[PDB]
């Protein structure tokens, strides 16, 4: 009896039936010019869609993957080289990385100074992992559907 009642009381504090609420979203690629990082709201958190230039693409391609804390090549994290889509939540303690800041022209988390490159890979600071890449697909040349 004690186990059942304590379990019910503990489970009462967890997420309720009205907040689970999975969904998807559509984003217009033509609305984001080259060099701009556009932020949206998805599942209650920031979602970054950044249009990368050829210079940035080549710079990320020159990165020596073996030296990375979380090794991944740039071409296995994006579908189209000129578009990088990432969840804008710092992997350290959840702050928001600030675009066009830091020593690597990627992102900078000011809460504790985490530096990310233009691929979202962790390069300096305390964060343990690369920014999360969500599931998404391109429905046409102009639109992308993230889910």
């Amino acid at each position: 009896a004690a186990k059942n009642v304590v379990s019910q009381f503990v489970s009462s504090m967890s997420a309720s039936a009205d907040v689970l609420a999975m969904s998807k979203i559509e984003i217009k690629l033509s609305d984001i010019p080259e060099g701009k990082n556009m932020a949206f709201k998805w599942r209650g958190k920031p979602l970054f869609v950044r249009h990368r230039t050829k210079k940035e693409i080549d710079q990320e391609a020159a990165v020596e993957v073996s030296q990375l804390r979380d090794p991944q090549h740039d071409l296995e994290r994006v579908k189209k080289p000129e578009w990088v889509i990432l969840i804008g939540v710092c992997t350290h303690l959840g702050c928001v990385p600030i675009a066009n800041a830091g020593d690597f022209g990627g992102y900078y988390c000011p809460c504790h100074g985490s530096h990310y490159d233009a691929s979202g890979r962790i390069r300096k600071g305390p964060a343990p992992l690369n920014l999360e890449v969500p599931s998404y697909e391109f429905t046409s040349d102009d639109m992308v559907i993230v889910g």
Binding site: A1, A17, D18, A21, S23, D31
Partner: protein, 241 residues
């Protein structure tokens, strides 16, 4: 007038101590609500996601939700638009405010049906007798225009016309659509809407009864075992002459 009429006690299938609700009746009552009662009344605290796992599957519930226009916004330009419904959307309200409701019903406000079973003395009996109680007014009694006679309504004069009649609706499962059948189905659906925790409550009550019936005699026996030392002792008074 001050007269009142107590509804009789019908033998509902869930009237028993452990009996649960019949889910097919819930399905039929939901159809009755959707196609008849939703034009006037409102059901604010029920969503399409609640119907899943009671009388519909996820695909059927999504199909039901998609048949509604829901206003959402603002878009990127700062404008509100319409879209199809989702499972997270509550049922659409028929009017935007009480004044609009009163304007379309000669000043009578249709109450919300999300707790009407719990909000009246009689529960399902009151609603069933109300929906199947209309008759001609008694001799030598008048009434306003726009009101109808119903002996179960207090005052014996109600502003709702008879909503249900023969062949009003065609059920999906080929059931005959009689007045009493439709009344029974909608009453069961209203009972579910007021108290969605009916079946889980009775399931837990069965276990509670069994466990307490087990636990009472054992604890009583422990108490008797401890107190047997006191309950059997003896006293002797031996003064020294």
């Amino acid at each position: 007038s001050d007269l009142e009429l107590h509804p009789p006690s019908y033998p509902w299938s869930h009237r028993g101590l452990l009996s649960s609700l019949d889910h097919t009746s819930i399905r039929r009552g939901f159809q009755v609500y959707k196609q008849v009662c939703s034009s006037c009344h409102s059901m604010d605290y029920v969503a399409y996601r609640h119907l899943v796992g009671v009388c519909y599957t996820e695909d059927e519930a999504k199909a039901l939700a998609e048949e509604v226009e829901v206003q959402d916004g603002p878009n990127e330009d700062g404008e509100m638009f319409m879209r199809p419904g989702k499972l997270s959307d509550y049922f659409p309200k028929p009017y935007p405010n009480p004044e609009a409701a009163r304007a379309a019903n000669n000043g009578a406000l249709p109450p919300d049906l999300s707790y009407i079973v719990r909000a009246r003395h009689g529960g399902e009996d009151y609603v069933f007798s109300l929906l199947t109680g209309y008759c001609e007014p008694p001799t030598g009694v008048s009434l306003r225009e726009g009101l109808y006679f119903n002996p179960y309504f207090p005052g014996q004069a109600i502003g709702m016309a008879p909503p249900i009649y023969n062949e009003v609706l065609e059920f999906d499962d080929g059931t005959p659509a009689t007045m009493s059948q439709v009344a029974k189905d909608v009453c069961t659906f209203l009972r579910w809407a007021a108290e969605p925790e009916h079946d889980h409550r009775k399931r837990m009550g069965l276990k509670m009864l069994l466990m307490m019936g087990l636990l009472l005699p054992l604890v009583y026996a422990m108490k008797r075992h401890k107190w047997s030392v006191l309950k059997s002792r003896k006293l002797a008074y031996r003064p020294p002459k």
